[PDB]
Design a protein around this ligand. Structure first.
Ligand SMILES: CC[C@@H](Nc1c(Nc2ccnc(C(=O)N(C)C)c2O)c(=O)c1=O)c1cc(C(C)C)co1
Length: 471
């Protein structure tokens, strides 16, 4: 029956994990050079999967006939399969902690004191053994009426020893993983800009001289400048908020002190309102033309402030470009924009309020009195921090975690469903199908490195070239 197939898959995975993880441990251990804190954690993960692989042929014979191998051998096998999970899930959380402090925050960890990394994973294996200590007490050979011997568990303390590793060995590292991986992915998405195009170095002369010449080119008098480079639309780029803010500013004396440049094509009702304001005020300029990135670069450097009153912005790409050339952004607190803009690098406002934006334009007017040379420079530093990219290296780790959860989450979710049922054939075969999914993981990580793992790929053929391989 289905029993023959199980033994095939078990023997098939066993080999793919043995060779797989052994190759991975070799490639990591061969050269100490270039090996990172993450490479150390991935090496421990490879060993955790390598140990669990060893129990698979004993588990294969356990399907044909029951658990005959011994009461002791149950504890041996049961500890390795539990330790492999708790260690593997905790090692993945340590990768998250390292990558969070390194990508979303600009802080390298344990680089100077690399000896401490060894103690971290030693602690991981230890905590993993203590988490799996109750199964060393309650897991043995269980005999029943007319059925083959089996390997499974059986007071109030026994449930506590099952509830304690359920939350601290599954939910606690998972919680840390969701916060860290989630917020790293968020900032990973944001940087798409190339500092080879948008840079301060490419600009000629000084930012105040570039401004006076821009105004002279735009037929406007000397003063503080505000720029808009979004699309003319309702409910997305919020040009209507800007045209209404200009309208309420119109009545004030401080309005004559400032100049406005509203660039963008779109909505004919918004195009009209922008042209009417241009024709009425000598300090308002509107460009319907679709300008080239070379001209926009000259604008970002010369103009003092860039206003982004966008209702929805998933990525602050227009702010990233503006900040890379040293323009203080007056953007509404929305997606991407709340993250990139700090009280040190721009002004944040309420999304759909034209009254509050006018007060931010007025606030920016008063802040310009003092030399904002450092404030403009801070924006260049902050945008650039986002500019550095690891995104390609991380694509491997995201595949690792994605596949880990796709293999272990269905087993743990079915585990809760059958334990809380006490406290069916459809749910019995469900646990039989989620079992083989968690087994398949044991050989998947090496395959991921063999597919998209750029350090492992090159590193493996680097060793092959040293000994055998040629041309
Ligand atoms: C799985 C084995 C493989 N490790 C790999 C990656 N790891 C990393 C992934 C993301 N971020 C880091 C990191 O934290 N930084 C500081 C770059 C990694 O290290 C890969 O990508 C990849 O492949 C490897 C490494 C080596 C040598 C360097 C010893 C040989 O094989």
């Amino acid at each position: 029956i289905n029993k023959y197939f199980v033994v095939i898959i078990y023997a098939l995975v066993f080999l793919l994990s043995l060779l797989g993880n052994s190759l991975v441990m070799l490639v990591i251990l061969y050269s100490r050079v270039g090996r990172s804190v993450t490479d150390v954690y991935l090496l421990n993960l490879a060993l955790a999967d390598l140990l669990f692989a060893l129990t698979l042929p004993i588990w294969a014979a356990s399907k044909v006939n029951g658990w005959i191998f011994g009461t002791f051998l149950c504890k041996v096998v049961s500890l390795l399969k539990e330790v492999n999970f708790y260690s593997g899930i905790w090692l993945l959380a340590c990768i998250s902690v390292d990558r969070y402090l390194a990508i979303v925050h600009a802080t390298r960890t344990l680089t100077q004191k690399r000896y401490l990394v060894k103690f971290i994973c030693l602690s991981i294996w230890g905590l993993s053994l203590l988490l799996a200590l109750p199964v060393l007490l309650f897991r043995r050979t269980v005999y029943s009426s007319n059925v083959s011997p089996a390997c499974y568990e059986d007071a109030n303390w026994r449930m506590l020893l099952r509830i304690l590793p359920q939350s601290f060995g599954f939910i606690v590292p998972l919680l840390i993983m969701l916060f860290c991986y989630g917020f790293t992915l968020r900032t990973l998405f944001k940087a798409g800009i190339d500092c080879s195009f948008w840079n301060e170095s490419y600009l000629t002369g000084s930012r105040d001289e570039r401004k006076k010449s821009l105004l002279s080119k735009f037929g406007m008098d000397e003063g503080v400048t505000f720029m808009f480079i979004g699309r003319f639309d309702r409910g997305q780029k919020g040009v209507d908020v800007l045209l209404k803010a200009i309208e309420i500013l119109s009545s004030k004396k401080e309005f004559q002190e400032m100049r406005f440049i509203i660039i963008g094509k779109g909505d004919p009702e918004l195009e009209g309102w922008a042209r009417s304001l241009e024709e009425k005020h000598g300090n308002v300029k509107v460009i319907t033309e679709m300008l080239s990135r070379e001209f926009v670069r000259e604008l970002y450097g010369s103009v003092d402030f860039v206003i982004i009153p966008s209702y929805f912005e998933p990525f602050g790409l227009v702010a990233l470009e503006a900040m890379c050339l040293g323009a203080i952004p007056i953007a509404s607190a929305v997606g991407g924009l709340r993250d990139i803009i700090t009280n040190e690098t721009g002004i944040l406002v309420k999304a759909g309020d034209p009254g509050e934006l006018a007060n931010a334009i007025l606030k920016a007017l008063e802040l310009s009195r003092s030399d904002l040379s450092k404030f403009r420079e801070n924006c260049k530093k902050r945008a650039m921090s986002f500019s550095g990219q690891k995104h390609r290296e991380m694509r491997v780790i995201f595949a690792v975690v994605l596949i880990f959860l796709l293999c272990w989450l269905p087993y743990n979710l079915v585990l809760l469903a059958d334990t809380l049922m006490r406290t069916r054939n459809h749910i019995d075969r469900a646990l039989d199908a989620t079992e083989i999914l968690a087994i398949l993981h044991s050989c998947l990580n090496p395959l991921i490195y063999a597919f998209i793992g750029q350090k492992f790929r090159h590193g493996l053929l680097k060793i092959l070239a040293i000994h055998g391989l040629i041309s």
